[PDB]
Coordinates of C-alpha atoms in Angstrom, one line a residue:
Chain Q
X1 CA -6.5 27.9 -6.0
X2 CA -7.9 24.2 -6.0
X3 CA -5.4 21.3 -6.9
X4 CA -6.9 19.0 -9.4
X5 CA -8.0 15.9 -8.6
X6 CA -6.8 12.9 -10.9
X7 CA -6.8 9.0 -10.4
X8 CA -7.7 5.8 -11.1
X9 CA -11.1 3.5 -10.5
X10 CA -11.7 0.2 -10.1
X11 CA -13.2 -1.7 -7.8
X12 CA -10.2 -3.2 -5.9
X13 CA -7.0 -1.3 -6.7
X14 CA -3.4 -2.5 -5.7
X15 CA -0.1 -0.8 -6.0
X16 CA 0.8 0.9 -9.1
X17 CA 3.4 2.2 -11.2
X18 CA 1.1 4.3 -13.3
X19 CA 0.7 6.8 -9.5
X20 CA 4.2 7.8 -9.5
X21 CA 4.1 8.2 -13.2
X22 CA 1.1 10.6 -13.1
X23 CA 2.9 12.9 -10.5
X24 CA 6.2 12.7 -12.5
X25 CA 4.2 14.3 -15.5
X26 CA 2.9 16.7 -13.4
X27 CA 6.3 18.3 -12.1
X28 CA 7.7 18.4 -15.9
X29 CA 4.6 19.5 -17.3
X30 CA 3.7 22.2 -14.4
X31 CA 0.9 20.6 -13.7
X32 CA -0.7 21.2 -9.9
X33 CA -2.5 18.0 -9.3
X34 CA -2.7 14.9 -7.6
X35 CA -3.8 11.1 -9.2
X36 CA -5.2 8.8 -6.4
X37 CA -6.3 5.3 -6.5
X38 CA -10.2 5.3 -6.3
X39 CA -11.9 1.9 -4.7
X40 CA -15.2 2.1 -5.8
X41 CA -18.0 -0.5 -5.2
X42 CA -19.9 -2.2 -8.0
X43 CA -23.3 -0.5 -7.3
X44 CA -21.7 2.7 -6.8
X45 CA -19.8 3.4 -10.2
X46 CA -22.4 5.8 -11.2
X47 CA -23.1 7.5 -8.1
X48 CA -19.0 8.3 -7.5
X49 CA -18.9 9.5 -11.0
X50 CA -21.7 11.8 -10.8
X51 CA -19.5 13.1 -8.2
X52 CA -16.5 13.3 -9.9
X53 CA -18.3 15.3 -12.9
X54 CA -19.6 17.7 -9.8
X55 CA -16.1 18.5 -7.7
X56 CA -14.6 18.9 -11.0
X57 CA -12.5 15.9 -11.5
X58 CA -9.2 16.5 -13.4
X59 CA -9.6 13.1 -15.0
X60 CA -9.9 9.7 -14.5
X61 CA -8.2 6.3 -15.7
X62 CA -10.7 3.9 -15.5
X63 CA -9.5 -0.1 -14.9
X64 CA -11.3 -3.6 -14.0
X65 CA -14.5 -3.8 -14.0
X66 CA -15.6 -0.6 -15.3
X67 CA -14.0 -0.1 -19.0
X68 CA -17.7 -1.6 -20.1
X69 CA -20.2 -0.5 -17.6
X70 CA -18.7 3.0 -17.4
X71 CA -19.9 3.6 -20.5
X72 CA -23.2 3.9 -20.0
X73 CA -22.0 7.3 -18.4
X74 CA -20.8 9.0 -20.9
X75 CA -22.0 11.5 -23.2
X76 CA -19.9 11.0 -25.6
X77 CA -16.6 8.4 -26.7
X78 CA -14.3 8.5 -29.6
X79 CA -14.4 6.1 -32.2
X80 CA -11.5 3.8 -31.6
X81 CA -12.8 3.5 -28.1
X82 CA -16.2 2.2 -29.5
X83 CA -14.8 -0.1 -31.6
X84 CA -12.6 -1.3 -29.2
X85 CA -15.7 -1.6 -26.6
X86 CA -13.7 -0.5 -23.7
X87 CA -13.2 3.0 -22.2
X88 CA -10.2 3.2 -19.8
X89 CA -9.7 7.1 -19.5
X90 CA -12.7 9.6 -19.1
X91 CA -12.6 13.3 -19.1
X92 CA -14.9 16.0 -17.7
X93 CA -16.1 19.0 -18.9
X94 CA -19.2 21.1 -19.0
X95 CA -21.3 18.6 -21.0
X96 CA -20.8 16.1 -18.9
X97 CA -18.3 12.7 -19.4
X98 CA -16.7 11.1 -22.3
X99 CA -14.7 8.0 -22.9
X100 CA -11.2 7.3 -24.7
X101 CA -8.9 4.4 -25.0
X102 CA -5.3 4.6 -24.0
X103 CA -4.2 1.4 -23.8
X104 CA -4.3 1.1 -28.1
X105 CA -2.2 4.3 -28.2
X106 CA 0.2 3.3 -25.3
X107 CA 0.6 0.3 -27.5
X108 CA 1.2 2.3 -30.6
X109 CA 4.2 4.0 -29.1
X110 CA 5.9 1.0 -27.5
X111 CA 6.1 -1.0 -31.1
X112 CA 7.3 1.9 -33.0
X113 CA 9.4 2.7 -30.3
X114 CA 11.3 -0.7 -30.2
X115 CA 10.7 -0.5 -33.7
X116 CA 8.6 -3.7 -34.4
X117 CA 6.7 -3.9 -37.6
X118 CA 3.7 -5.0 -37.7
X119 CA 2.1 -4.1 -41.1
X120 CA 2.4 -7.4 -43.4
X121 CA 3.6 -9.2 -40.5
X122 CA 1.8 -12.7 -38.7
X123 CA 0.4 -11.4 -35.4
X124 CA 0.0 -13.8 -32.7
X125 CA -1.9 -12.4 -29.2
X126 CA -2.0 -14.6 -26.0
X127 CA -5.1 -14.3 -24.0
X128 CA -8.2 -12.8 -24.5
X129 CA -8.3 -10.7 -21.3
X130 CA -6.7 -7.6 -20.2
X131 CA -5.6 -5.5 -23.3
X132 CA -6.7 -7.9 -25.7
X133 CA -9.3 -5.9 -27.1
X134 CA -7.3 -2.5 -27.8
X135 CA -4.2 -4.6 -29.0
X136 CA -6.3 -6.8 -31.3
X137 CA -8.1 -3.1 -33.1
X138 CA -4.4 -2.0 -33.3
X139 CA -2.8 -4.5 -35.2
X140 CA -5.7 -4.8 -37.4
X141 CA -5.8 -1.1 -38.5
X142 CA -2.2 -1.4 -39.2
X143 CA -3.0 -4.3 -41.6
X144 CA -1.1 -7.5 -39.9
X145 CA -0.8 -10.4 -42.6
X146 CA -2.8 -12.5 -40.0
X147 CA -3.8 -12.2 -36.5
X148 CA -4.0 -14.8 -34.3
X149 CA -5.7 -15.2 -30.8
X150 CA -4.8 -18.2 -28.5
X151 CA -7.1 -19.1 -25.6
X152 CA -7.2 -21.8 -23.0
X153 CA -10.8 -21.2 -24.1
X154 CA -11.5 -22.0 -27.9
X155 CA -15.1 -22.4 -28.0
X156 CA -15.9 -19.7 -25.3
X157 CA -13.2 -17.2 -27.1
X158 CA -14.4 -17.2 -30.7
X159 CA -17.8 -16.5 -29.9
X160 CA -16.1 -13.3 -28.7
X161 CA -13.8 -12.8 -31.2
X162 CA -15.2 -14.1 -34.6
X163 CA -13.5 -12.2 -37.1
X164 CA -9.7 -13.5 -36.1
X165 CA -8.4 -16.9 -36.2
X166 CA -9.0 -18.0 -32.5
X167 CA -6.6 -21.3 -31.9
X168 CA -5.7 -22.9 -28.6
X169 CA -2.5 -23.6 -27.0
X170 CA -1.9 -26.5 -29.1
X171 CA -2.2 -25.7 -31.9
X172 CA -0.3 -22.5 -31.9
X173 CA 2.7 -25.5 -31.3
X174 CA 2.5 -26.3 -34.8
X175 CA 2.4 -22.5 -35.8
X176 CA 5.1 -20.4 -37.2
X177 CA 5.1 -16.2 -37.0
X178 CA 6.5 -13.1 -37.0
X179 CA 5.4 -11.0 -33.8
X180 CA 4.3 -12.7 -30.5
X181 CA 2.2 -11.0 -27.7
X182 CA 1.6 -11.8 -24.5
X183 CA -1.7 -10.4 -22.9
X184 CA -2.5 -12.6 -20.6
X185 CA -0.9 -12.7 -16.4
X186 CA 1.4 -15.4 -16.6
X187 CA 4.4 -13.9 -15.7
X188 CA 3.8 -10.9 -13.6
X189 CA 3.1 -11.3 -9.7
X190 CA 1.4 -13.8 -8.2
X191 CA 2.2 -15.8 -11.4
X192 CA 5.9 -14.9 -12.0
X193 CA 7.6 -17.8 -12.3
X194 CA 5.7 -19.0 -15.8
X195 CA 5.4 -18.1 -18.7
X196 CA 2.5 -18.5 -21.2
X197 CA 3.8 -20.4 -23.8
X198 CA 7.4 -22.7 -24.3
X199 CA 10.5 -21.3 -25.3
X200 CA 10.6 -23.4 -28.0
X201 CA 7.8 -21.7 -29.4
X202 CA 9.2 -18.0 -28.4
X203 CA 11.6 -19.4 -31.0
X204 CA 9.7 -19.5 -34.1
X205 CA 8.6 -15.7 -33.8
X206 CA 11.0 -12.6 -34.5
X207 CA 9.9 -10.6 -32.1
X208 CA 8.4 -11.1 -28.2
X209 CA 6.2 -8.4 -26.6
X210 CA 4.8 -9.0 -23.3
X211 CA 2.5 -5.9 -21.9
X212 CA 3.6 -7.2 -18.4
X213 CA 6.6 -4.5 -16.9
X214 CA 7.1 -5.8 -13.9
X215 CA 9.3 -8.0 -14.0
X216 CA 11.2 -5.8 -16.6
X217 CA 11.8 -9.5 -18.1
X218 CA 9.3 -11.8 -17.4
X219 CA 10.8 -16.0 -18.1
X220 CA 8.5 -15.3 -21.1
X221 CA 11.2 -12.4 -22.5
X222 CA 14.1 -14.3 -21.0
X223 CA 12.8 -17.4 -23.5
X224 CA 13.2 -14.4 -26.6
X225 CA 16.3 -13.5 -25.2
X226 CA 18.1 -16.8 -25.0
X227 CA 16.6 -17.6 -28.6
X228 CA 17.5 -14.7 -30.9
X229 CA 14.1 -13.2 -30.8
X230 CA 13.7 -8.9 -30.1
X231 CA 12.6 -8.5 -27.4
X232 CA 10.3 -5.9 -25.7
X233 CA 8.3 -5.6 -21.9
X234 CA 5.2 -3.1 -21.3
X235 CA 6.8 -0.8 -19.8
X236 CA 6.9 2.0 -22.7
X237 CA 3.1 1.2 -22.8
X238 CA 2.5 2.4 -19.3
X239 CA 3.9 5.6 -19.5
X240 CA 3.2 6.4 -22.8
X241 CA -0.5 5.6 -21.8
X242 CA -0.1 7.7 -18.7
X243 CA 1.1 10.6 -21.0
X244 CA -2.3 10.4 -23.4
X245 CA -4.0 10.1 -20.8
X246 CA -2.5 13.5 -19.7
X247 CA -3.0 14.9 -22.9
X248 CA -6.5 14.3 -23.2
X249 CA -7.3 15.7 -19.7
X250 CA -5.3 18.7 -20.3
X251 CA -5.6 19.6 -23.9
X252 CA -1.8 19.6 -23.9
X253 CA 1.3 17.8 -25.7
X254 CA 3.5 16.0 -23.6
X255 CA 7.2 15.7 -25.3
X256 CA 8.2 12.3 -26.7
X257 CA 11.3 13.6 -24.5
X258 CA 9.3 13.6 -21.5
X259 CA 8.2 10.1 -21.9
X260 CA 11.4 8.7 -22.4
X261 CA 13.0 10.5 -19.1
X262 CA 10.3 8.7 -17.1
X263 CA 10.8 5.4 -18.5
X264 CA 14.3 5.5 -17.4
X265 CA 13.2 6.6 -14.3
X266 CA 10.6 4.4 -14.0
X267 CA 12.9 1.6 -15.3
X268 CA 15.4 1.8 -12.6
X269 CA 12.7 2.0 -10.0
X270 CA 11.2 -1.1 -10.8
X271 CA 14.6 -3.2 -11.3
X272 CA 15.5 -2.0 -8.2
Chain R
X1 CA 0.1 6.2 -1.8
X2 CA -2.8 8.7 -1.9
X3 CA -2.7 12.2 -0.8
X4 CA -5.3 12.7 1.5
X5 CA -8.2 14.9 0.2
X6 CA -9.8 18.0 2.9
X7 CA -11.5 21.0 1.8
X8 CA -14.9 22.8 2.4
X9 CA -18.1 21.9 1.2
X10 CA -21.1 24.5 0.1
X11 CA -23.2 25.9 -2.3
X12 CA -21.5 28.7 -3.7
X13 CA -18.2 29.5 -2.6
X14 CA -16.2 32.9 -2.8
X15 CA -12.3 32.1 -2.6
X16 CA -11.1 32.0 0.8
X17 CA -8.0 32.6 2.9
X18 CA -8.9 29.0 4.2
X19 CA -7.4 26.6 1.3
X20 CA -4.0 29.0 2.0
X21 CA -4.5 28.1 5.9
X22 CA -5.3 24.7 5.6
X23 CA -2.1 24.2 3.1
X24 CA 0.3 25.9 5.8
X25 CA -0.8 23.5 8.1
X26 CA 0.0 20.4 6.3
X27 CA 3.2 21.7 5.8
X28 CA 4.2 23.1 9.3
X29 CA 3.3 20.1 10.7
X30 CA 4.1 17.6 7.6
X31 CA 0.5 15.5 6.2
X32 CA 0.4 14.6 2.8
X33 CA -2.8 16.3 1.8
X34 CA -4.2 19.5 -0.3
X35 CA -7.9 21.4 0.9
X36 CA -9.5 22.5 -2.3
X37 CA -13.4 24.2 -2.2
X38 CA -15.9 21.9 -3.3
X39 CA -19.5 23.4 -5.0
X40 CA -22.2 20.9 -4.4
X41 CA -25.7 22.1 -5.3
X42 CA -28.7 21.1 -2.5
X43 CA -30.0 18.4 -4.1
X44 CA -26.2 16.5 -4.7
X45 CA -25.8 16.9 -1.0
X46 CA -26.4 13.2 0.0
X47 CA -24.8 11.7 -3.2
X48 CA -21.4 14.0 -2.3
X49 CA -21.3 12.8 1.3
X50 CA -22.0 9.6 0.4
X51 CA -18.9 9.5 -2.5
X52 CA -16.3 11.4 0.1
X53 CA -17.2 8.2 2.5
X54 CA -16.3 6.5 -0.6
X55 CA -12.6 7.8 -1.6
X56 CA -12.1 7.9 2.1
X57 CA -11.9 11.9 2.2
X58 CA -9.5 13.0 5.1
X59 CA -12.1 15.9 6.1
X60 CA -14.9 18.3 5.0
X61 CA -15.6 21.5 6.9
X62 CA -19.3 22.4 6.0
X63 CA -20.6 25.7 4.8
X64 CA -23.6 27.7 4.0
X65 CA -26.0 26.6 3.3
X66 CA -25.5 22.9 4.7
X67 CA -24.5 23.4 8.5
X68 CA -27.8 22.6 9.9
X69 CA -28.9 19.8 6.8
X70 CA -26.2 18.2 6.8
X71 CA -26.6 16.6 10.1
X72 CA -29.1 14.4 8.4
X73 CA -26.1 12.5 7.3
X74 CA -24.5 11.7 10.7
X75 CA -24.1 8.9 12.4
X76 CA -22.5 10.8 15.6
X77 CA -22.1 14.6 16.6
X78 CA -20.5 15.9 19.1
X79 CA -23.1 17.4 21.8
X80 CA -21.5 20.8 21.4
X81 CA -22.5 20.6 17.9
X82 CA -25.7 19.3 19.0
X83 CA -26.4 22.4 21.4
X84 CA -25.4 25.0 18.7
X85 CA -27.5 23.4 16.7
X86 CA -25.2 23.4 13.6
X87 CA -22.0 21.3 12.1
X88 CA -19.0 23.0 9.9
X89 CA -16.8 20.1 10.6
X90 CA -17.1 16.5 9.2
X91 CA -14.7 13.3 10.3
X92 CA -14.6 10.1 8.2
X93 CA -14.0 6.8 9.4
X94 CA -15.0 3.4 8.6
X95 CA -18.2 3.2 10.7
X96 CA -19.5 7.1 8.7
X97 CA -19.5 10.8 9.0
X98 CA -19.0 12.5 12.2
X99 CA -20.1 15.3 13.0
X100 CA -18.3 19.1 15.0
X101 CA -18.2 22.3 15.4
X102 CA -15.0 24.0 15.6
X103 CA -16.2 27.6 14.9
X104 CA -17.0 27.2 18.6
X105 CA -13.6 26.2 19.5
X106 CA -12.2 28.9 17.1
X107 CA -14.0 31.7 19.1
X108 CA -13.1 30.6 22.2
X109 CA -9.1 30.1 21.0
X110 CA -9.7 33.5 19.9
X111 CA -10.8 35.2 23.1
X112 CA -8.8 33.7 25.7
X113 CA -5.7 34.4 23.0
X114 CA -6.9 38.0 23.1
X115 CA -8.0 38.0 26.7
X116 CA -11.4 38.9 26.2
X117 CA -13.3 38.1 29.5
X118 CA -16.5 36.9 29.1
X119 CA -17.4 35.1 32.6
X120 CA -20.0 37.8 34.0
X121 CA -19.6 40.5 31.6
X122 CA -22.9 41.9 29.3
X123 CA -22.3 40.6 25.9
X124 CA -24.2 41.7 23.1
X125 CA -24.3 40.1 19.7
X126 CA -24.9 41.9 16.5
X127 CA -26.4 39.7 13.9
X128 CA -28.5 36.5 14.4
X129 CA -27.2 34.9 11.6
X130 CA -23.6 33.8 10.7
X131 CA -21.8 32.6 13.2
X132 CA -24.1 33.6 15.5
X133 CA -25.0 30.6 16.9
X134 CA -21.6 29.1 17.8
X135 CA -20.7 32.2 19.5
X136 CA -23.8 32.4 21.0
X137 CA -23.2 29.1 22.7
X138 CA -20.0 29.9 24.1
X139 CA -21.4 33.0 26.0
X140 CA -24.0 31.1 27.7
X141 CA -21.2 28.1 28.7
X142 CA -19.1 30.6 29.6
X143 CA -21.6 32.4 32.2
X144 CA -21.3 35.4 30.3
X145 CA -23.6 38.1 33.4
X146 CA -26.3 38.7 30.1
X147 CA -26.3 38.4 27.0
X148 CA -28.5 40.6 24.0
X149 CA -28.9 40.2 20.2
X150 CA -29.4 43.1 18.3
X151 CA -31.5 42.8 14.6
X152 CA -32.9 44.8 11.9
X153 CA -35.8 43.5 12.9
X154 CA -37.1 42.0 16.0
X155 CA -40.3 40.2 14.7
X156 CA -38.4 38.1 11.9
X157 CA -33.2 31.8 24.8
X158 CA -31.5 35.2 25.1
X159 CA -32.8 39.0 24.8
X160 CA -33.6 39.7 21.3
X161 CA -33.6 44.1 20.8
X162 CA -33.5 46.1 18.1
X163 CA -30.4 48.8 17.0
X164 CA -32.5 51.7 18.6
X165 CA -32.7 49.6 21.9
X166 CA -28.6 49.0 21.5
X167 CA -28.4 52.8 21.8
X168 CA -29.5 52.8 25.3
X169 CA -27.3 49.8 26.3
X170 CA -24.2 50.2 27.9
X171 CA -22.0 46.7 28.2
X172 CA -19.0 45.1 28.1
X173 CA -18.2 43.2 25.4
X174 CA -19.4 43.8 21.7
X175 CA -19.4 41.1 18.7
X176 CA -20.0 41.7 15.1
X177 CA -21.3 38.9 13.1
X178 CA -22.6 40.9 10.9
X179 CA -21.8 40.9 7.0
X180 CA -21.2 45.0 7.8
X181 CA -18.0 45.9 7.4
X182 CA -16.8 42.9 4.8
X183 CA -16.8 43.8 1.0
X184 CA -19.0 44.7 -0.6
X185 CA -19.9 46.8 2.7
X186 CA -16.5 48.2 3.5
X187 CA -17.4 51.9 4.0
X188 CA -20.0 50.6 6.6
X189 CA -20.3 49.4 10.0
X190 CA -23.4 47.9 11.5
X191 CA -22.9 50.4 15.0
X192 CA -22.4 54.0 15.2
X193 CA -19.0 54.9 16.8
X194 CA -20.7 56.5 19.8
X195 CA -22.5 52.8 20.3
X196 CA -19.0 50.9 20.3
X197 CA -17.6 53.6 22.7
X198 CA -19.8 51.8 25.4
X199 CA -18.4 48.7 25.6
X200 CA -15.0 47.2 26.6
X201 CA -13.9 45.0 24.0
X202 CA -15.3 45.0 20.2
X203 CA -14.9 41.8 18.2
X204 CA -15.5 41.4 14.9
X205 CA -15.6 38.0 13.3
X206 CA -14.9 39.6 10.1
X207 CA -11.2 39.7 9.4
X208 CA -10.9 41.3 5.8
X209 CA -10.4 43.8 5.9
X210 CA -8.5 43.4 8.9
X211 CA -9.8 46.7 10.3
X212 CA -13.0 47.0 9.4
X213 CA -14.7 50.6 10.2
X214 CA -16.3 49.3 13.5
X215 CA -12.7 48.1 14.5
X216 CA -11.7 51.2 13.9
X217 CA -14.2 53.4 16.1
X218 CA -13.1 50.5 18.8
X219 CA -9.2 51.5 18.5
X220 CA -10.4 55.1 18.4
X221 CA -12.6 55.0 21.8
X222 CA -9.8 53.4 23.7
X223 CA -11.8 50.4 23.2
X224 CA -9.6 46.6 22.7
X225 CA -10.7 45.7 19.0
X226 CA -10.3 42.2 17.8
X227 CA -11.1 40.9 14.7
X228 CA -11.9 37.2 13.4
X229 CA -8.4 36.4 11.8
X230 CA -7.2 34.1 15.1
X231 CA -10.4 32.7 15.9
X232 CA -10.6 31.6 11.3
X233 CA -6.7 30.0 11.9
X234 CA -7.5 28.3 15.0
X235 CA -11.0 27.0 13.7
X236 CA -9.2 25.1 10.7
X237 CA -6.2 23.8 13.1
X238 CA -8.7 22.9 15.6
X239 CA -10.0 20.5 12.4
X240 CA -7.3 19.3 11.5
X241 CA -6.6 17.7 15.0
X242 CA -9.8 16.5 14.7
X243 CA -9.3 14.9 10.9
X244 CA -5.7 14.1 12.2
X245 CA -6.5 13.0 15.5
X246 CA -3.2 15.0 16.3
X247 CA -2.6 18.0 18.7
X248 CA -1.3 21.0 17.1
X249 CA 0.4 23.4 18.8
X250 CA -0.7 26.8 19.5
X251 CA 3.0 28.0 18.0
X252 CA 2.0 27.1 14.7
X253 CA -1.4 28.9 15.0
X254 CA 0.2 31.7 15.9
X255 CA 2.5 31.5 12.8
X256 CA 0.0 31.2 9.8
X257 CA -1.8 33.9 12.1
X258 CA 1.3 35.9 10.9
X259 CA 1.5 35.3 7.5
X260 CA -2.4 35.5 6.7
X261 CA -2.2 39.0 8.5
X262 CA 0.5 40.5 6.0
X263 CA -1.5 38.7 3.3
X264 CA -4.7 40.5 3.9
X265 CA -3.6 43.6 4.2
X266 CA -1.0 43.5 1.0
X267 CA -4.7 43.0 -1.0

């Protein structure tokens, strides 16, 4: 009986959270399988994942700089991954590969889960990078009032992103809102000690996401805290996005009451 | 932190007592790792290497049909691999693939744990295929007194004969590596008992069952009968202290020796 073979590529992969996640699912699902971190060169994506798709891969989480390129791989990917543009999670069967998107259902669970409205509600994202993309189709197909994105990078962003209001830093100073999100790395390691925007303008929003977990409160969330504002760090979002993944792979159901357990796990760990 | 990633690369592959041998292992001697069997069709040969190097695979042992191609892929092998002519046992490290053969060792753990004498003996080999090479090897460094391999037939280094020549032969030790004896030829044995009554010690490299028939007209002639369970246990420690650069001690062969015995026969 072979264990499957799970994991993560990317082409240079640090420690991660999301590892002991995966093997926590595993246990409380009864799950006999492994999830690896996966170093793959540039001008070998396609090679390793012809390899994959031939030892069977369980699954695979795909990360930087593959979400696009790894596309061209794939048989087949669902439609909010296509209009995201971005694949993060790819599963194997006898066709062959296709592509999904995680991340915008991770993010899903973490705002009804803290309970932040979004529907109706002025949307400000910060950055253009990282989960940009699948937080930006998320809060559009739940009908945000107005979406904004704020870039060091005006001219270069809303080329990318046409369709929202793309502002820089200073003008979202003279902006008032209801939800603020913070996509970009200011805050998390090696960039810990700042934050992406002032506290005095943390304090004109209702409620402060940041997809960053680790710290579980980033001087970006303190900012929300000391001013009134809900706040919320992405830590929901990783392990509900483990979970789908999980899902996808397996053709299974994972129990909001599994998710939940390994957040407080996880939570612990990491403030530890 | 990864879990190291072993297991056995081939064409098509039966299930085998192996993954179960290779998991004792990790645990009796405590590495982080799981074997599983890996199909890779001829022509993905390369690519799979190639991607194992890649992940950083803790170990391949190699399988029909790839023991003699995949030396192609080398960048060293061991000169006892070299002289057999064939590798079932693939190290990673940063510079490539390295290339062994531990069936060789296996055989030879086998016999001396068994006492089977082969310095200046007559050794005849049933089979020229399977692991007849390996074994083949290991008479001749051993200074086995002569040494005959019987076939089907003689016109598909040593003395090649046929089964009608065998039945004039009288020797000491005789090897099966013939797929006689092993499902689905149970009911069958390449030698008639009056042939294995000849010889001193039978061994067969097949160890399910773990009598086979010519085992049993061995035991029956007063003749020692050995069959290819030990020599299969040692042959996967003897890579893992090559994948592990570790020594493993002969205690713990002799323990999954133990359990995979009461396994086979419960089936």
């Amino acid at each position: 009986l072979n264990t499957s073979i799970y994991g993560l590529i990317g082409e240079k992969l640090g420690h991660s959270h999301s590892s002991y996640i995966h093997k926590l699912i595993f246990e409380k699902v009864g799950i006999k399988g492994i999830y690896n971190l996966f170093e793959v060169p540039k001008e070998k994506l396609k090679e390793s994942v012809d390899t994959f798709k031939i030892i069977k891969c369980g699954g695979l989480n795909v990360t930087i700089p593959y979400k696009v390129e790894v596309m061209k791989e794939l048989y087949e990917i669902s439609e909010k991954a296509r209009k995201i543009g971005a694949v993060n999670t790819l599963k194997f069967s006898r066709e062959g590969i296709s592509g999904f998107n995680t991340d915008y259902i991770g993010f899903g669970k973490m705002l009804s889960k803290f309970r932040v409205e979004i529907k109706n509600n002025i949307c400000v994202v910060l950055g253009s990078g990282g989960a940009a993309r699948a937080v930006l189709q998320y809060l559009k197909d739940n009908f945000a009032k107005d979406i904004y994105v704020v870039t060091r990078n005006p001219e270069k962003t809303s080329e990318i992103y046409g369709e929202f209001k793309v502002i820089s830093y200073d003008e979202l100073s003279n902006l008032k809102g209801d939800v603020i999100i913070n996509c970009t790395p200011k805050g998390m390691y090696p960039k810990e000690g700042e934050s992406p925007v002032d506290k005095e303008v943390v304090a004109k929003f209702s409620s402060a996401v940041d997809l960053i977990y680790n710290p579980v409160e980033t001087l970006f969330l303190k900012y929300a805290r000391e001013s009134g504002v809900k706040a919320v760090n992405g830590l929901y979002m990783l392990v509900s996005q483990a979970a789908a993944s999980e899902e996808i792979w397996n053709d299974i159901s994972i129990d909001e009451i599994i998710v939940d357990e390994i957040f407080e796990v996880l939570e612990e760990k990491i403030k530890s």
